[PDB]
Design a protein around this ligand. Structure first.
Ligand code: HEM
Ligand code: HEM
Ligand code: HEM
Ligand code: HEM
Lengths: 141, 146, 141, 146
């Protein structure tokens, strides 16, 4: 459960992401594929090569959804219902993988928002991605 | 794996009593039932809509027997699991695209299946030996992923 | 979330546990200590020997708590609040250990309830233990 | 670990640029803040009531430098993390009662700190190599648990 400070922290940090969210989306995926090669098992149909337009495009998609979630920080379950559906009934990504993408996204923000990536902000973002993960995997069974 | 000799004997003794055909079907069926996301790999298997549909599906049963067959062989080369499972590891990764976490889920399901079947004979320490074994197999199976 | 089916399943199987809950609780702990030795780091103050009264005493407490969750299957967050607080604030058990106990609890039931431990019941029990774990860990941060 | 000569160089070279003092104090502080339950082992350190209070605690900072110190020395024995951390492994188990999962949490925190610090320089391929290292160290430390 996200506290008011957390929600604040998150909106601030993401606020700064801005026009680069797509790019960060892409970079986190790239980091994931390289660090946790098992995650590649869900993208056999993609070109996983550096700067692949498939990865780029996907990065955008993920970023936008994250944006939408920050915007509806208060009503996540509802804002991401379709996405929870998609993952639970179509994609069926194993729940362990959500932690891997979450970690790669933190790393990405760290690397790009030095001034803004304080310990308190780091904590908030982590809890946020955890909440997002929970929602996305809540209809699995 | 870190199996003391007495752990290796205990694994071996019990495995002698197992009906691989039957345990095979049970473990795979239960996997698709407890963690329905795992069904993603078997859409050509037909109806997996309910527990009865899964547990009694001739394809699930047959596949289960195949998987446990490969596993039983693993048990005779407890010394070289990575070796034993190398071509299979390659296959699961490159052709099948099966996330290795699936192998840990099945390991846990199997331990429940052995508990179910053997009752009191599945002692705390027998379980600990099997835990080491299913982890080794899962590891062996994930070793060639890249 | 637990469905009506799940609830019937759990009340049914737990119903059968009856007066053996305590012993089954004790047994699950021992299986956990033996298979997942890292869990012992939380019980440095216990005699973890075979047939330790400490373990026996501890097994009862866990079983009583589970029995209490079954009794309040429609209000677990509330029936378990106290325990959630304890684990979050004093014990501070790492989240991952919950899954290890759950697993050992499933093993014990399987070993004791061959007739009731059907695929469907197994699935319901798994989701239940996951829910209990989620509650106990809800207040961690 | 199972580091490629190239992956070896990448680690080796970034490390040479690391101020162990600062990084160690920050890795440990962030751990205490992001995963509050890790504070169970540092009651005697004082006030950990706030991020500010943790980050400022000198007992925290000094513990951080001792931890990174030992980590640092381990990068010199990348081919035998096991034998390099055996005694530390026994201590953590037998004397400190530290759950090895903590080793994993720190590893990840560590990676976030490096990124935080080196921005651009901490590329995906460089992170991949550090990830193998942190995992390797955590495994080595966990190795003598029983
Ligand atoms: C941070 C949590 C996540 C979010 C917000 C997220 C969001 C999304 C979005 C927005 C899409 C595209 C939906 C559409 O096409 O309309 C998607 C698709 C997909 N996601 Fe998730 N995702 C997350 C985690 C994961 C993880 C961890 C994996 C796998 C390791 C994954 C695997 C997939 C796959 C395979 C697709 C389909 C890609 C394609 O075929 O184009 N997702 N996700
Ligand atoms: C103990 C672990 C496992 C062993 C020893 C094992 C063994 C096998 C073997 C021997 C085959 C047939 C190889 C061939 O077709 O040439 C196979 C196929 C397959 N396995 Fe695995 N398996 C294991 C676990 C799993 C798990 C947990 C999953 C998915 C959740 C899985 C998914 C598949 C699939 C989808 C196929 C191909 C089926 C088809 O013919 O369409 N396996 N496995
Ligand atoms: C769903 C699972 C769990 C339940 C129902 C549960 C329940 C309880 C209960 C009822 C108590 C006793 C509190 C009192 O004194 O009134 C307790 C204490 C404790 N639990 Fe948990 N617990 C669970 C999971 C865990 C796990 C996974 C661990 C660590 C592996 C753990 C470690 C402890 C410890 C160290 C104590 C204190 C015991 C003592 O010193 O007497 N618990 N738990
Ligand atoms: C990179 C992983 C780690 C390394 C290399 C490491 C290394 C060390 C070293 C060198 C000491 C010195 C104590 C002595 O020699 O008597 C120490 C002590 C200690 N460590 Fe670890 N450590 C690691 C991770 C952790 C983590 C994650 C925790 C808890 C969150 C932890 C808890 C402790 C505690 C409680 C002590 C005792 C300090 C004291 O005596 O006040 N360690 N560690």
């Amino acid at each position: 459960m996200l506290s008011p400070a957390d929600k604040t922290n998150v909106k601030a940090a993401w606020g700064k992401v801005g026009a680069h969210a797509g790019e960060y989306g892409a970079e986190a995926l790239e980091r994931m594929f390289l660090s946790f090669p098992t995650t590649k098992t869900y993208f056999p149909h993609f070109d996983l090569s550096h700067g692949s337009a498939q990865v780029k495009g996907h990065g955008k998609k993920v970023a936008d959804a994250l944006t939408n979630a920050v915007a509806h920080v208060d009503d996540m379950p509802n804002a991401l219902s379709a996405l929870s559906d998609l993952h639970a009934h179509k994609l069926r990504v194993d729940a362990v993988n959500f932690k891997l993408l979450s970690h790669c996204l933190l790393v990405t923000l760290a690397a790009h928002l030095p001034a803004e990536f304080t310990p308190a902000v780091h904590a908030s973002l982590d809890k946020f991605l955890a909440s997002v993960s929970t929602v996305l995997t809540s209809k699995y069974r | 794996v870190h199996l003391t000799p007495e752990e290796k004997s205990a694994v071996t003794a019990l495995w002698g009593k197992v009906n691989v055909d039957e345990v095979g079907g049970e473990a795979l069926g239960r996997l698709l039932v407890v963690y329905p996301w795992t069904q993603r790999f078997f859409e050509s298997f037909g109806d997996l809509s309910t527990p009865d549909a899964v547990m009694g599906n001739p394809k699930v049963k047959a596949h289960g027997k195949k998987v446990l067959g490969a596993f039983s062989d693993g048990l005779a080369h407890l010394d070289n699991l990575k070796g034993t499972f190398a071509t299979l590891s390659e296959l699961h990764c490159d052709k099948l695209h099966v996330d290795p976490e699936n192998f840990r889920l099945l390991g846990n399901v199997l331990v429940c299946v052995l508990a179910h079947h053997f009752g009191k004979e599945f002692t705390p320490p027998v379980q600990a030996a099997y835990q080491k074994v299913v982890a080794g197999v899962a590891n062996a199976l994930a070793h060639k992923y890249h």
